[PDB]
Amino acid sequence: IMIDAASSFVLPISITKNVDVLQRTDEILWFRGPSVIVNERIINSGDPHLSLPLNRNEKESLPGPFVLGLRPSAKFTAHRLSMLR
Amino acid sequence: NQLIPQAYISNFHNRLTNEDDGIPIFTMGNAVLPDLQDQHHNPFNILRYPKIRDTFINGKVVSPYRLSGEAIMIPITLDIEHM
């Protein structure tokens, strides 16, 4: 198991004409491995569909992942904006 | 560290032979000295003056020398040409 590997490669031909959305050096960084997509960094460990209680085949499509993201209500945000000035 | 020492600068004879100061010994903002303006307590800000950076550059290293009821004042003149 090695730690001090390079894991970064840049092609010498500069085709930096229409490339401004990627991660530039400031050239294009090319890794040895792909990227990973994480939807929400917070996990609601309640919400008993995930915790599976032992009391009582059912399908249910919940609206959006934001149930599992601890999203606050807009009234507290409006109250904090009223407390801002 | 980062302290300027007290001694070992004696750039005096080059100012005696600088040919611009009013010295009759040898023949052959807008202020010059920052004794009224601050440098924000930084040493490098003293290097912008030409009469001080000349002292820092053209200095030399010397060695320290170690050594009646009515006074009679007699003026003594001196006039000797040499080299």
Partner: peptide
Amino acid sequence: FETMVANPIKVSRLQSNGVLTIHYSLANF
């Protein structure tokens, strides 16, 4: 296009941990 190997960019851990960013301190004339 398959003969276009690139240049590796090293980590330089001793230059990654605590490198800073001497005539500026007046002690060497």
